[PDB]
Design a protein around this ligand. Structure first.
Ligand SMILES: *[C@@H]1O[C@H](CO[C@@H]2O[C@@H](C)[C@@H](O)[C@@H](O)[C@@H]2O)[C@@H](O[C@@H]2O[C@H](CO)[C@@H](O)[C@H](O)[C@H]2NC(C)=O)[C@H](O)[C@H]1NC(C)=O
Ligand SMILES: [Ca+2]
Ligand SMILES: [Ca+2]
Lengths: 298, 293, 4, 62, 4
């Protein structure tokens, strides 16, 4: 009873202040959002079906390029990595800061969102990639032109790096719910996609395989979790659009936790919703960098 | 005394809560404002056609970036169009203006194109032989070529050529035109007697010359013009007009500022001395009937 | 993670 | 009257948890406006203070 | 330019 009312008050008042601080932070931000951010990306002359054709055509620098995978639709912007693993990599996903929101609905994920590239300062062209999702229709169309390999890279907050390479990667069209398929793995990050979390056993490990899964968003449940409570859905809890099973071993489109380490009592729904890759850092570490790139196989 | 001390907290705990309820509602409103991408200042226009004149004819009124799809081409590609107040639409295929882009490239880069396109036309670039060949060789309709120079004083000249055209890769994107149409920059494409020799004029003309790069010599020299000069061009033995040459700042350079001693700057003999590199350059084409009909 |  | 002190004792523990999450949520959100809006408010989250108050409140319940 |  004594010191009890002493501390219990030192909390209520401390918290009442934190709230005012948050109210102001959010109020300032809402103000900054009256004006948009801007980029100026002059377009390279050299173009092609994808980034591998561009590199072969002489495009040597990493920056945004215009590509036309097919004469059906209009050419579109993309960031090409021409230095990593012999270049010719078309980036379809990228996380590096937390500049973009990835907890989006089905339509945005179908059409693509985020910023493909930004200005490298004192440069008329955009040589730095932004954070974005290319878009499921475009991803599917790209992986269906011919055999395709997938390169996944990540980095922790200390600078250590690992990768996951899949010699085969395909995403079906929307009619098949953008179903995924990957094979021929080789890497140092752990084959999370085909095998599921390594620190899990039997059935529990199996329900984290992504290979074979359909795509899901918080407003479109196609996961491998059979349930009734509309709240119990991988996308709603783990916060991103992804080929969720029940639920994941890797959540590259998760929430961007600053610093890396986070706890269940920090997560919105109490789950490991960060930019995760269990097979390397477990569920409670959120990568500093994450990206997915593709390139015609051969 | 506890009755008040304890009930004092209750009024705060429930105060913080209702505040949280309202704070979470604003966080939701903020999310609604953070879904769009940064706005890009460079936009590509909606109107498209066979070339930039086709686009102006359809109503386009501003210079910038448009997609064109020449009559026989497999796909559409991007180009910079210059649309004037008179409805003339020029397809620009070459631009120099600050020496930021390196023009010492190989056959494929000159074939495919390099540099960057900007809406305000403030970037250097080479469209690409294959695209220039596609545009200039569409269904019968002669194109006219205009050269635009600018020295480091603000002076500018021009040089027009009738029935401009560039052949297919099989014939090395050969350059051809029917004749010089006029211009105060002079007809450098017909050669220029440099003085060093009587046959200079003959060996430095360009009409009929195939395109050359250091890794693909098609010139009339036993040596390698493109390689010695560091560029891509319709070389003879070697040149009189050399728009894809080295960008020398100030305009004036000497035999000493060059590696081989050969004048490899942005030159146009009939207007300036070989040791004077232009400050800006632009090569663009337009259907001939368009040029003062 | 999983949902055992 | 101790009936309520015992109550507020578990309501403050709940608000702490709730706030800690709102803190992390607001931080992720505000930052996600940097690729959309003119700029993103520069800040930091003080986790240790939330953890300190927690341990602190759990000690009082004992 | 020209050539020898
Ligand atoms: C599959 O996992 C479940 C859930 O266990 C929890 O989550 C795991 C990922 C791991 O972190 C465990 O330490 C967690 O406890 C296991 O379920 C068992 O359920 C019974 C009753 O519901 C419970 O008494 C046990 O504690 C749980 N685990 C056991 C047996 O100790 C299940 O055992 C796991 N199965 C496999 C193949 O590992
Ligand atoms: Ca489900
Ligand atoms: Ca030769």
């Amino acid at each position: 009873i004594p010191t009890n009312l002493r501390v219990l008050r030192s909390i209520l008042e401390n918290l009442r202040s934190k709230i005012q601080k948050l109210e102001s932070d959010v109020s300032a931000q809402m103000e900054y959002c009256r004006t948009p951010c801007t980029v100026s990306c002059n377009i390279p002359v050299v173009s092609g079906k994808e980034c591998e054709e561009i590199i072969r055509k002489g495009g040597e620098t990493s920056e945004m390029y215009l590509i036309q995978p097919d004469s059906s639709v209009k050419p579109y912007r993309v960031y090409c990595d021409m230095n990593t693993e012999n270049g010719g990599w078309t980036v379809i996903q990228n996380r590096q800061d937390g500049s973009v929101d990835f907890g989006r609905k089905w339509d945005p994920y179908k059409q693509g969102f985020g910023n493909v590239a930004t200005n490298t300062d004192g440069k008329n062209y955009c040589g730095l990639p932004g954070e974005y999702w290319l878009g499921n229709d475009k991803i599917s169309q790209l992986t269906r032109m011919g055999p395709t390999e997938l390169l996944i890279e990540m980095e922790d907050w200390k600078g250590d790096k690992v990768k996951a390479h899949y010699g085969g990667f395909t995403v079906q069209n929307e009619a098949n719910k953008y179903q995924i398929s990957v094979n021929k793995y080789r890497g140092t990050a752990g084959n999370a996609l085909m095998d599921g979390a390594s620190q899990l056993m039997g059935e529990n490990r199996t329900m984290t395989i992504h290979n074979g899964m359909f795509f899901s968003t918080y407003d479109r449940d196609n996961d491998g979790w059979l349930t009734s409570d509309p709240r119990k859905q991988c996308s709603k809890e783990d916060g991103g659009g992804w080929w969720y099973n029940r639920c994941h071993a890797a959540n590259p489109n998760g929430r961007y936790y600053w610093g890396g380490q986070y706890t269940w009592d920090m997560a919105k729904h109490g789950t490991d919703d960060g930019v995760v890759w269990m097979n390397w850092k477990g569920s409670w570490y959120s990568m500093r960098k994450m990206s997915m790139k593709i390139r015609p196989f051969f | 005394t506890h009755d008040s001390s304890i009930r004092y907290l209750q009024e705060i705990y429930n105060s913080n809560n209702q505040k949280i309820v309202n704070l979470k509602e604003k966080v939701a409103q903020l999310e609604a404002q953070c879904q769009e991408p940064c706005k890009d200042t460079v936009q590509i226009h909606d109107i498209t056609g066979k070339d930039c004149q086709d686009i102006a004819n359809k109503g386009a009124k501003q210079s910038g970036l448009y997609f064109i799809k020449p009559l026989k081409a497999n796909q559409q590609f991007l180009v910079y169009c210059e649309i004037d107040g008179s409805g003339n639409g020029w397809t620009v295929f070459q631009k120099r203006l600050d020496g930021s882009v390196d023009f010492k490239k190989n056959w494929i880069q000159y074939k495919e194109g390099f540099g960057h396109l900007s809406p305000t036309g403030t970037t250097e670039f080479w469209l690409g032989n294959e695209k220039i060949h596609l545009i200039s060789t569409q269904s019968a309709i002669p194109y006219a070529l205009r050269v635009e120079l600018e020295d480091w004083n603000g002076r500018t000249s021009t040089a027009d050529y009738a029935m401009f055209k560039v052949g297919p890769e099989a014939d090395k994107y050969r350059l051809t035109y029917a004749y010089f149409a006029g211009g105060d920059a002079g007809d450098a494409f017909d050669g220029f007697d440099f003085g060093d020799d009587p046959s200079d004029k003959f060996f430095t003309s360009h009409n009929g010359m195939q395109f050359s790069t250091w890794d693909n010599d098609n010139d009339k020299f036993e040596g390698n013009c493109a390689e010695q000069d560091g560029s891509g061009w319709w070389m003879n033995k070697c040149h009189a007009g050399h728009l894809n040459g080295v960008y020398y700042q100030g305009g004036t350079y000497s035999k000493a500022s060059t590696p081989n001693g050969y004048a490899n700057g942005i030159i146009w003999a009939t207007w300036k001395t070989r040791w004077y590199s232009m400050k800006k350059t632009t090569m663009k084409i337009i259907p001939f009937n368009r040029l003062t009909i | 993670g999983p949902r055992p | 009257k101790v009936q309520h002190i015992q109550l507020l004792q578990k309501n403050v523990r709940a608000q702490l948890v709730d706030m800690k999450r709102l803190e992390v949520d607001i931080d992720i959100k505000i930052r996600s406006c940097r690729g959309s809006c003119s700029r993103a408010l520069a800040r930091e989250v003080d986790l240790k203070d939330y953890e300190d108050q927690q341990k602190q409140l759990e000690q009082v319940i004992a």
